[PDB]
Design a protein around this ligand. Structure first.
Ligand code: HEM
Length: 153
């Protein structure tokens, strides 16, 4: 996938994200639901969190956003060989939650967005290109794994 000098850009940011992972994680979930309300339907647990304000104030939502980013970071860190980290993610998203590859792309777009919003002097063109290509490789590999579980995407 990526060249070392892209991974360098990816890891470069990521280090700047971890100090506030929790905050980032929650903004990504809230933004997902608010820009794409269909995704909210896949979370039985957040079903009731109807207004925005009930989202901003859920500590389940923050906890789950933190969980989403944590796994991402683990996978970004393995750089190009991240199969042992993806597999369990692919399995649950395919056989359990049943998440389309399109929703995957939706969240990847927001992750990039949230980072840019939060790190204006550091998240530049180059880093943005590289981040995208990293999330794109993740999306692909997820989609591929999905097939081994009989799920389409
Ligand atoms: C690429 C970003 C994503 C990552 C890194 C991520 C990862 C997480 C992790 C670590 C879990 C819990 C462990 C597991 O069940 O495997 C979680 C739960 C789950 N994920 Fe994701 N996820 C991704 C995107 C998506 C998207 C776009 C959706 C669609 C709305 C989604 C919906 C869910 C659901 C429904 C659960 C169940 C939560 C619960 O049991 O209440 N995920 N995911």
């Amino acid at each position: 996938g990526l060249s070392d000098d892209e991974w360098n850009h990816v890891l470069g940011i990521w280090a700047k994200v971890e100090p506030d992972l929790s905050a980032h994680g929650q903004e990504v979930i809230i933004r997902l639901f608010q820009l794409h309300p269909e995704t909210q339907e896949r979370f039985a647990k957040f079903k009731n969190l109807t207004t925005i304000d009930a989202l901003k104030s859920s500590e389940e939502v923050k906890k789950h956003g933190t969980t989403v980013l944590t796994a991402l970071g683990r996978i970004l860190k393995q750089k190009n060989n991240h199969e042992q980290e993806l597999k369990p993610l692919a399995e649950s998203h395919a056989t359990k939650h049943k998440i389309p590859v399109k929703y995957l792309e939706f969240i990847c777009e927001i992750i990039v967005k949230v980072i840019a919003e939060k790190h204006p002097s550091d998240f530049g063109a180059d880093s943005q290109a590289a981040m995208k290509k990293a999330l794109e490789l993740f999306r692909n590999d997820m989609a591929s794994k999905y097939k081994e579980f009989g799920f389409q995407g």
